[PDB]
Amino acid sequence: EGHSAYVALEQRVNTRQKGIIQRHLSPYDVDIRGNGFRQIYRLGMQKIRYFGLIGTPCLLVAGAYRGIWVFCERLEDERYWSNAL
Amino acid sequence: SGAVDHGQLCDLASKYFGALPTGQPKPSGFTRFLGGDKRETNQLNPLTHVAVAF
Known about the structure:
The structure is cut from a larger assembly and holds chains A and B.
Chain A: H1 5-13, E1 18-25, H2 36-54, H3 56-81
Chain B: H1 6-17, E1 36-42
C-alpha cells in the first residue's frame, strides 16, 4: 500500500495529522435496521430533486426530437400511401 | 492501619459517624459492554500506545 501514488500525494499535501479522535462501534452492536427508513426517504428525495434538475435539458431536446420524429413519420406514411416512393 | 486501637477507632466512629443516614442502596443497573475502537491520531508522537481489552 506504500510506494503508491495516492500515498505520495497524501504525504506531499496533507500535514502530519494531529488532534483527530475516531470512535467506531463493532458491527455486532449496530442494528442493520438502524437509520434505514429515514435514509431511504431522504436519499430518495435528494435523487428526485437532482434528477429533476439535471434531466431537463434532456427533456427539452427529447421534446424537440419527438416533434421532428412525428413530422417525419407522418410524411413517410403519406409518401407510401400515395405510391410516391 | 498500623499502631492503632480497634476499640478506640470504634468509639470515635460511633461518636462522629453514627448519625449518617441509611440512604437508598447502591444503584444496580446494567452496564453494557460495547466492542469497538477509540483511536486518536497524533503522528508527531514518538511512541504509539495500544490497549486491547475484553
